Write a protein that binds this ligand. Structure first.
Ligand SMILES: [Ca+2]
Lengths: 81, 63, 272, 37, 318, 48, 110, 398, 271
C-alpha cells in the first residue's frame, strides 16, 4: 500500500487535497455501510484499494489479508519482538 | 534497567534461551550481551578492566 | 520491526482501543451492548484479544516523545500487538526520536475521526518523511552497529604488504550466487579476494586509471589488467569479457540493494 | 562484571506546545484539532 | 569394527549432582562435525526433559513468607531447598509426593515419600532443620517437562505454593572439532563434553539428545499431510488404507461412483509412451489430466499431435 | 527488470551510505528507499 | 461373557467336525506378530457387535505350527470363516482385513 | 509380440518391477532373533520403553510393501500383481497409487475377490484345507503380464509367497524368464512363508528351480541357517551383545547355496547387521536396532521392507558396481539406515495399544507420550497423598 | 490435539534450473522450531550430494593457448560455461563424460555424452560456439560430492584444466518461525524455504536433508559387539642428598610429584 499511496500522489497536485478527498470518500463509504468497516476491512484502506483499482491495476479489497496458517480460533499470532 | 558501576546503564530488550546465546570456548553461554559501541562514546574503560578481572576472580575463587 | 511499525503491549493497546474493541464486540454480536462488552473486556476473554488484534489492523497511532526534539518527535506508526509489557520501537526511528535506551517513555495517541486517521496514514508515516526540511538530507540513515556491519562488509581485501609476506615479483565465480554459496559453505572468507564474471556493463566505481598491464597475445586476444577488474577483448571478435576482482562482502551489499529493489517491484506488480 | 538492577520499573498524559508546532509542520489540521477537542 | 566410532573418553562424578562426561566421534567428513556439534548443542541444552518439584502444599501456615516454630528456615527457604533437589523419572504426568515426618532433626531429600515412577538422585540434599518435636507434613507435586516452569501465578489451588522448577538437567555442554589430518577427504574429529545434574549420566544425555533429534527430523520423512484420504476428523489413522475403504463402502451403498481425483492414469489403459510422458510431467490423477489442455500436452517433450487424439478417445470410452 | 545501480567496490561508511540514500530517494522515491533501508538495516545488523 | 476364546488344535477339530449353529471365526495369531494385535482389536468389537450370533476363536500358530501348516496358513494374521452349514465352503482371509468386510462375509456369502 | 523401441522415454532412476501379492499388513513368518541392543539403557528405561519378552523378527512383508518402501526412497517402483474389483481391491489399488507406485501392471479382476480365497475344510481324517478358489492376488495369468513394464524395468523383484500356488508359480517363473530374456537383474527376497519352515527338503525343492535364476538374493540370517542346515547354537533374549549371536558365516558355508548366475547374496540380521557375499568379496556392516517399537510394530516387518528397498535402490542406480567391495559396504549401510527409518516411522504411525487400569474399524491406539504418561498416584489411601491428621503416621527423624 | 505433520504450501518452477518450495511443519513445542530450522538449513546447504563437472581435458588440442581456432569462446570461458552445467546423478566415485562434436554450430549441454547414472537438467545451456568446420573432443570428469567436502587431488597436471565447481544443489535455504498463543498453548509453526537449481525438487531436498541429518545421529545410538598428602614434602622424609638434589632439579617437591613420575623406594616405603 505504501507504494500505492505514493503512486496516487504522483498524479495528484496537492497532497493536502488528496487526503481530504480520501477522508471525504472514506466517510461516504462508512455512512452507506456502517457494519462493514470495523474490523479486517478499514474504510480508508478500501478507498485506497479502490483508487488503485480505478487506475486499472489489481489489489485486494482494502488490502485485507487473512492468516492461512492460523491453527485455531483462539490462537492469535504472537509477534517475535 | 540494568547498569554497572561505570555508568553503563542499560534497558533489557530481549530475553533469549540459553542455547542461542553466544557461548565461550568452555561451552558456557553468556548471561548478558552489551553493545561495545557504548565504551568509545561514553569513555568509561573501567568496565573493561572490571569485566576481565571479574572473570579471573571467579575462576581463581578470589575477590 | 519494519520502518513504519511499532509494537504495543496488550495492556496498553486495550486502553487506547477501548472504544473500538467494544464496537467490534457489538458489531459481531459477541456483546449485546456497551455494558456487556466492558465487563467482557475486564473478564479478558480470548475473543477480546482477537477483536483487538483486528481492530488495530490498519489503524495508525501517533508516537510522541515528551521531551520533543524535532518534527519527528511526534510520528505515526502502524501498531501491531506484541508480547510483553513494553513498547517495541524501530531502531532507525529511535534516532529520529533520539530515543536512548538508558530510559525513555513515549506518549501514544490514537486518532479517532476518519479524517485524522487519513492524514495520520498519508502525511505522518515514516515512509513519506525521509528528508529533513532543514537542508533536504535523509534522516533514517543507518547508524551505530548498522553502520559498523556495512563498513565491515565493504572493508575489502587486505592489499599489498598486508596481504603477502613476500613481494610476488584466486577463485573465479561465474555468477554472484556461486560466490555467496561458496561463502556459506566456508570455502572462502568474507574478505578473501575473488574474481566475479561480470555479465553487465562496466559498473564498478574505481579511480580512472590506465590498465596496470595489458597481455596482448599474438592471435589478437588481449587482456587488460586494471587495478580492480580484468577485461578480455579481442581483435578478431568483440567478446568483451569482464571479471571483477572483489569480495563476498561487496557482492552481498550490492545484491542486498538489488534484491530489495526487485522484491519491492514484484510485490507492487503494476504490470499485472 | 558486577551488574545492578535499577528501581524505575518498581517505583513507576499532556501534549506540549512543541508537538503543536510539529503537527502544524505536517499540516495535519484535523489531527491537531483532535488533540484540542 | 565400525569405520565411524564413538566412545566416552572420560567420565567423572565430581559430586552427587554434577556428572561430567566427554565423548569422541571420529572420523567425520568435513562439515559433518559442525552440523552434529550445533544440533547436539541445542538438543542437550533445551530438548531434554527433566522432572522436579512443581508446587508444595503446607497446612497450617498463612503464606509462603511466614515462619514456622521449630524450623530454623523460613517457608521461602524451604521452597528454594525443594526447588534445588534433583529427581529422575522416565514417565510424564503430575505425581504426588509426601514429606510427612516429625522432628527434631534434619529433613533431607531421603525423607520424601516418592511414587515408584520417580527416584531421588541425591538423598543428602538438605531441605529443612527441625529444632523441636513438631509434626511437619508437606504435599508435593512432581512433573516431567521441558524448559523451565512458568514463573506466573498458579496458586488458585488449596494453598499449594508454586515452585519455579527448572526442568533442564544438562547444566552445560561443549563441543570441539579437530582436524583428523587425513589429507585425502578432510576428515575431522568431534569431541562432546556434557555436564548433567545427576538425573541422567552424560552418556544417557548423549543418547537422549540423539533420539530427540531424530524425532525432530523424522516427521519430514513421514508422508505429506493430506496425502491419504481421511474423514477430516481424526487426523491420525494407524492404518491409512482403512479410511479410504470406509469411503468406498459408503460410496457403493449410495452408488455415487468414485470421484476423478481418486482415479489414477495407471488404470486408464494408456500406451506406455503416453503413460511415461504424463508421469514425467507430474500428472498422476485423471482429474489432473483433465485440468490440462491439448496445447499444455503438446509442449511436453515426447508428446505429438497424433497422441492427444488417441488419448481423448481412450477417455471417451471410459 | 534489472536495476541500474552502481557496484560500490571500495568501501562504504557514514558519508558514503548517506549519499547513497540521497541518490536512491531522488531516483526510486521514498517508498522504495524505505524498503531498501529495512534491508540495509537487517544486513548491517546481521553482519555486525 | 462373550469374547475371543483361546483354543488349541484339538479344540478346533470337534468344533468343525461337530455341530456349528453360528459362523465360526478362526483367528490364527502369534504374540510376536504386530498386525495380529491390531487384528485382535477388530475381533474384540466384532464379537461384541455379533454377540452370540457368531463365534470367535483364536489359535496360536507358534504352538499349533503343525496344524496351521495343514490349514495352509501362509502367514499372519489369517482369519478362517467357517459356515454353520457344512455344505458351504470356508473363507480364508490373509492380511489385516477391515472390519466392514468381515461383516458382509459372515452375514451373507457364507 | 514386441513393440517400438521406446527406450528413449525411460527416465532415471530405472524402474523396478515388484512382482508378488499386495497384502495389507501380512507377515510371512517370524523367527527368534538377536538384536544389537544397549541393555544398560533398557534396564533404566524399562518403565517407559516397551520391549517384547521374546524378540522375534519377521523377514519382511509382501512384495507390494517393498514397492511402497522403494517409492518412498525416491526410487521408481512398479507393482505387478492382481487385485479384485471390490472395496478392498480398489482401496489397496488406491493405496499403491497414492504412494507413487506405478500400478499399470496391476490387473483388476471382477470375478475374483481380494484376499478372500475360498477354502474346502476336509474333516474325514485329519482336517486339511484345499484352495477351491484362489484369492484375487493369486489368479494372475501368464497373459496378464505387462511386458512393457518388464521392458522398462531394469530389475525384477519377487518373494517366495508367489510360489505357494501352482498357477502363481508358473506365472512367476514366466515373468522371471521374460525379465531374464530382457536383461533385467533378478532380485529374490526369500521371506520364507510360515508353512515352509517345516520339512526343509520340500522347501529346497520348491525354490531350487527359481534359486538359480536370481542374480541377487536377500535372505535373513535365520533363513540362511535353515537353508544351510545350520543349527542355531547362540542364546536368545540374553542381555548381552555377544559376538556369537551376530556371527559372519564364512564364504565356505555359503558356497553350497551359490550358483553361476548369483552375484550378491545378502544375509540380513535385521538392521543390526547385514552380510554380503560375492565371488571375490565378502563382509558385513553393523547397524542399530534400538529403534522405537510398539506391540503394533514388534514384528519388525517394516525394517525388512526398508532394508530390501534400500538394497534395490543402491543396486539399480549403479548396476556396474555390484562386484565392488567399497560400494557394497555403502549399499549395506544405506539399507540399514532405510530399515531403521521405516521402523521408526511405523512406530509413530501405529502408536501403542491402550493401557490397562469411536472408530469404524475398531482400533484403539495411544501415542508415545500417552504410553509414557504415569498414573497420578492420587489415591486417598495411597502413601503418596496427604491424609487427615488421624492417620498421618509422622515418621521420626534421626 | 494435532499431530506433527508437514505440508508443502508453495511450489514454483519458474525455470529449468530454479525450483522454489515452501514447507510448513506444525505443531512444534517452544524452542524446537529454531533447532529444526537451523539443522535443516545446514543439511540443505552442504550435506546434500551434488553432481557437477570437475575437470576438462581438451583432447586432440595441443595448442595450450587461451583460444583455439573455430571456437569463439576462449578456453577459460569454456571452463566457465562447463562450471554452470547443472547435473543430477547417483554415481559413486568418479566417471568420465565426453563432448565430441562436429564443425560449425552451438555446443550445448545436450551434446555431452553422459555416463549411465547422470542426467542433464537443462540441455539448452550453452557451452561453446563453433564457427569453422573443426571437430572438438572434450574429456569431462563428473564427480558427486557434498557441499562442505573438500578435495585436494587434481589429476596432477596432464593438460587437464581443473574446474572449481561448487557442489551446492540447493541454491538457498531459509527458515521462519510463527508462534501462536491460546492463553497457555504456545505452539510454534516452522516454515522451510528451499531453492534448488533443478537437480532435485525442493520436496526431494527436504527429504534428503532430513535423511542426511538422521544418518549423522544414528552413530550415537550404535553399540558394539562383545567378546567373552599435598602438605608433606620430600624435605621431611630423610633422603640421601644425591637423591634429594635429583628430585629437586625435576621440581619434585611433594610426594604427589614423585608418584606422578615413573634403594630409593626401600627407605621411602616404610614412611
Ligand atoms: Ca527378507
Amino acid at each position: 500500500m505504501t507504494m500505492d499511496i505514493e503512486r496516487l500522489l504522483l498524479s495528484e497536485d496537492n497532497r493536502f487535497e488528496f487526503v481530504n478527498s480520501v477522508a471525504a470518500e472514506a466517510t461516504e463509504y462508512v455512512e452507506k455501510n456502517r457494519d462493514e468497516y470495523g474490523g479486517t476491512k478499514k474504510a480508508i484502506f478500501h478507498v485506497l484499494s479502490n483508487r488503485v483499482n480505478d487506475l486499472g491495476f489489481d489489489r485486494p479489497e482494502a488490502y485485507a489479508e487473512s492468516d492461512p496458517y492460523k491453527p485455531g480460533p483462539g490462537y492469535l499470532k504472537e509477534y517475535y519482538t | 534497567k540494568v547498569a554497572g558501576r561505570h555508568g553503563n546503564k542499560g534497558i533489557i530488550s530481549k530475553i533469549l534461551p540459553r542455547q542461542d546465546m553466544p557461548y565461550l570456548q568452555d561451552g558456557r553461554p553468556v548471561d548478558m550481551v552489551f553493545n561495545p559501541l557504548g565504551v568509545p562514546s561514553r569513555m568509561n574503560v573501567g568496565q573493561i578492566f572490571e569485566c576481565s578481572l571479574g572473570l579471573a576472580g571467579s575462576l581463581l575463587d578470589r575477590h | 520491526l519494519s520502518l513504519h511499525r511499532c509494537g504495543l503491549p496488550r495492556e496498553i493497546a486495550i486502553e487506547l482501543f477501548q472504544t473500538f474493541v467494544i464496537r467490534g464486540l457489538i458489531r459481531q454480536h459477541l456483546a449485546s451492548n456497551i455494558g456487556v462488552a466492558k465487563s467482557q473486556i475486564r473478564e479478558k476473554k480470548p475473543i477480546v484479544w482477537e477483536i483487538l488484534q483486528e481492530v488495530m489492523q490498519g489503524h495508525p497511532v501517533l508516537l510522541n516523545r515528551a521531551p520533543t526534539l524535532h518534527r519527528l518527535g511526534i510520528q505515526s506508526f502502524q501498531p501491531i500487538l506484541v508480547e510483553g509489557r513494553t513498547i517495541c520501537l524501530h531502531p532507525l526511528v529511535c534516532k529520529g526520536f533520539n530515543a536512548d535506551f538508558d530510559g525513555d517513555q513515549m506518549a501514544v495517541h490514537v486518532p479517532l475521526s476518519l479524517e485524522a486517521q487519513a492524514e495520520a496514514r498519508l502525511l505522518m508515516f515514516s515512509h513519506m518523511n525521509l528528508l529533513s526540511p532543514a537542508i533536504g538530507d535523509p534522516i533514517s540513515v543507518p547508524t551505530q552497529d548498522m553502520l559498523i556491519g556495512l563498513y565491515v562488509l565493504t572493508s575489502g581485501t587486505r592489499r599489498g604488504i598486508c596481504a603477502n609476506r613476500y613481494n610476488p615479483c584466486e577463485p573465479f565465480f561465474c555468477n554472484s550466487y556461486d560466490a555467496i554459496g561458496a561463502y556459506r559453505q566456508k570455502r572462502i572468507n568474507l574478505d578473501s579476494p575473488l574474481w566475479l564474471r561480470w555479465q553487465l556493463d562496466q559498473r564498478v566505481i574505481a579511480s580512472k586509471e590506465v590498465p596496470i598491464e595489458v597481455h596482448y597475445e599474438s592471435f589478437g586476444n588481449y587482456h587488460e589488467i586494471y587495478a580492480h577488474y580484468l577485461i578480455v577483448r579481442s581483435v578478431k571478435k568483440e567478446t568483451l569479457y569482464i571479471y571483477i576482482r572483489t569480495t563476498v562482502g561487496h557482492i552481498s551489499f550490492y545484491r542486498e540493494i538489488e534484491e530489495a529493489i526487485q522484491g519491492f517491484s514484484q510485490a507492487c506488480s503494476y504490470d499485472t | 562484571p558486577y551488574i545492578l538492577k535499577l528501581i524505575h520499573q518498581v517505583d513507576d498524559q499532556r501534549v506540549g506546545e512543541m508537538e503543536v508546532w510539529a503537527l502544524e509542520g505536517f499540516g495535519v489540521a484535523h489531527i491537531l484539532q483532535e488533540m484540542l477537542t | 569394527t565400525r569405520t565411524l566410532q564413538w566412545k566416552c573418553v572420560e567420565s567423572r562424578r565430581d559430586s552427587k549432582r554434577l556428572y561430567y562426561g566427554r565423548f569422541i566421534l571420529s572420523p567425520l567428513m568435513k562439515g559433518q562435525a559442525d552440523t552434529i556439534g550445533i544440533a547436539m548443542r541445542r538438543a542437550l541444552l533445551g530438548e531434554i526433559e527433566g522432572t522436579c518439584i512443581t508446587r508444595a502444599k503446607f497446612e497450617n501456615i498463612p503464606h509462603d513468607y511466614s515462619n514456622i516454630v521449630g524450623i530454623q528456615e523460613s517457608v521461602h527457604e524451604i521452597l528454594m531447598n525443594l526447588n534445588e533437589i534433583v529427581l529422575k523419572s522416565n514417565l510424564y504426568g503430575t505425581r504426588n509426593a509426601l514429606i510427612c515426618v516429625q522432628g527434631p532433626g534434619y529433613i533431607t531429600a531421603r525423607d520424601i515419600i516418592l511414587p515408584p515412577s520417580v527416584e531421588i538422585v541425591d538423598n543428602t540434599q538438605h531441605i529443612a532443620t527441625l529444632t523441636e518435636p513438631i509434626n511437619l507434613c508437606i504435599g508435593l507435586k512432581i512433573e516431567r517437562n521441558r524448559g523451565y516452569s512458568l514463573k506466573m501465578s498458579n496458586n488458585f489451588e488449596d494453598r499449594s505454593y508454586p515452585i519455579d522448577a527448572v526442568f533442564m538437567p544438562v547444566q552445560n555442554a561443549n563441543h570441539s572439532i579437530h582436524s583428523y589430518g587425513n589429507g585425502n577427504e578432510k576428515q575431522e574429529i568431534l569431541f562432546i563434553e556434557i555436564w548433567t545434574n545427576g538425573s541422567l549420566t552424560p552418556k544417557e544425555a548423549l543418547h537422549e539428545a540423539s533420539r530427540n533429534l531424530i524425532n525432530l527430523f523424522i516427521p519430514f520423512l513421514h508422508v505429506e499431510e493430506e496425502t491419504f484420504y481421511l474423514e477430516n476428523n481424526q487426523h491420525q489413522v494407524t492404518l491409512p488404507l482403512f479410511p479410504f475403504h470406509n469411503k468406498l463402502v459408503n460410496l457403493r451403498q449410495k452408488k455415487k461412483e468414485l470421484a476423478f481425483q481418486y482415479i489414477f492414469i495407471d488404470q486408464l489403459e494408456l500406451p506406455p509412451r503416453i503413460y511415461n510422458c504424463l508421469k514425467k510431467s507430474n500428472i498422476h490423477t485423471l482429474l489432473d489430466l483433465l485440468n490440462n489442455s491439448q496445447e499444455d500436452l503438446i509442449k511436453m517433450e515426447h508428446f505429438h499431435i497424433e497422441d492427444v487424439k488417441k488419448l481423448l478417445d481412450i477417455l471417451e470410452k471410459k | 527488470e534489472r536495476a541500474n545501480l552502481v557496484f560500490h567496490n571500495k568501501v562504504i561508511d557514514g558519508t558514503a551510505i548517506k549519499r547513497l540514500i540521497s541518490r536512491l530517494i531522488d531516483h526510486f522515491g521514498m517508498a522504495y528507499t524505505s524498503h531498501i533501508l529495512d534491508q540495509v538495516k537487517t544486513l548491517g545488523f546481521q553482519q555486525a | 461373557d462373550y469374547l475371543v476364546r483361546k483354543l488349541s488344535a484339538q479344540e478346533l477339530q470337534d468344533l468343525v467336525k461337530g455341530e456349528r449353529k453360528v459362523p465360526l471365526i478362526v483367528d490364527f495369531y502369534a504374540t510376536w506378530c504386530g498386525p495380529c494385535i491390531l487384528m485382535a482389536q477388530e475381533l474384540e468389537m466384532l464379537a461384541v457387535e455379533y454377540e452370540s450370533n457368531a463365534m470367535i476363536v483364536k489359535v496360536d500358530t507358534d504352538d499349533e505350527y503343525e496344524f496351521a501348516r495343514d490349514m495352509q496358513v501362509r502367514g499372519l494374521p489369517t482369519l478362517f470363516f467357517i459356515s454353520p452349514d457344512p455344505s458351504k465352503d470356508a473363507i480364508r482371509t490373509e492380511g489385516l482385513i477391515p472390519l466392514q468386510m468381515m461383516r458382509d462375509i459372515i452375514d451373507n456369502d457364507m | 509380440h514386441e513393440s517400438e523401441d521406446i527406450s528413449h522415454t525411460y527416465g532415471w532412476p530405472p524402474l523396478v518391477c515388484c512382482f508378488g501379492s499386495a497384502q495389507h499388513a501380512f507377515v510371512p513368518s517370524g523367527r527368534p532373533a538377536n538384536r544389537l541392543l544397549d541393555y544398560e539403557r533398557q534396564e533404566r528405561m524399562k518403565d517407559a520403553v516397551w520391549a517384547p519378552e521374546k524378540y522375534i523378527r519377521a523377514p519382511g512383508g509382501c512384495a507390494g510393501g517393498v514397492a511402497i518402501a522403494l517409492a518412498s526412497l525416491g526410487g521408481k517402483a512398479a507393482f505387478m500383481g492382481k487385485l479384485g474389483d471390490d472395496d478392498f481391491g480398489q482401496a489397496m489399488l488406491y493405496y499403491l497409487n497414492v504412494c507413487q507406485v506405478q500400478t499399470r501392471s496391476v490387473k483388476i479382476d471382477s470375478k475374483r475377490v481380494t484376499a478372500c480365497s475360498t477354502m474346502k475344510i476336509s474333516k474325514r481324517g485329519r482336517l486339511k484345507s484345499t484352495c477351491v478358489k484362489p484369492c484375487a492376488e493369486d489368479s494372475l495369468s501368464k497373459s496378464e503380464i505387462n511386458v512393457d513394464v518388464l521392458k522398462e524395468a531394469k530389475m525384477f523383484y519377487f518373494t517366495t509367497h508367489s510360489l505357494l500356488d501352482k498357477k502363481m508359480m508358473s506365472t512367476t517363473l514366466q515373468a522371471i524368464k521374460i525379465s531374464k530374456q530382457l536383461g533385467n537383474v533378478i532380485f529374490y527376497d526369500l521371506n520364507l512363508p510360515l508353512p515352509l519352515w517345516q520339512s526343509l527338503e520340500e522347501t529346497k525343492s520348491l525354490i531350487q528351480e527359481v534359486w538359480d535364476l536370481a542374480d541377487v538374493i536377500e535372505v535373513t540370517k535365520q533363513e540362511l541357517e535353515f537353508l544351510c542346515g545350520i543349527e542355531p547354537t547362540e542364546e536368545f533374549d540374553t542381555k548381552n551383545n555377544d559376538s556369537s549371536k551376530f556371527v559372519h558365516y564364512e564364504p565356505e558355508t555359503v558356497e553350497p547355496l551359490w550358483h553361476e548366475n548369483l552375484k550378491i547374496l545378502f544375509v540380513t540380521n535385521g538392521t543390526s547387521k547385514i552380510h554380503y557375499y560375492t565371488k571375490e568379496h565378502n563382509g558385513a556392516v553393523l547397524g542399530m536396532e534400538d529403534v522405537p517399537i510398539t506391540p503394533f510394530t514388534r514384528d519388525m516387518s517394516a525394517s525388512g521392507d526398508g532394508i530390501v528397498a534400500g538394497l534395490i535402490r543402491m543396486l539399480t542406480v549403479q548396476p556396474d558396481l555390484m562386484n565392488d567391495k567399497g560400494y557394497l559396504e555403502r549399499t549395506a549401510r544405506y539399507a540399514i539406515e532405510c530399515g531403521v527409518v521405516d521402523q521408526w516411522l511405523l512406530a509413530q504411525t501405529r502408536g501403542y495399544p491402550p493401557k490397562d487400569d469411536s472408530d469404524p474399524n475398531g482400533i484403539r491406539s495411544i501415542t508415545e507420550r500417552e504410553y509414557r504418561t504415569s498414573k497420578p498416584y492420587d489415591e486417598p489411601d495411597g502413601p503418596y497423598v496427604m491424609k487427615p491428621v488421624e492417620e498421618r503416621e509422622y515418621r521420626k527423624l534421626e
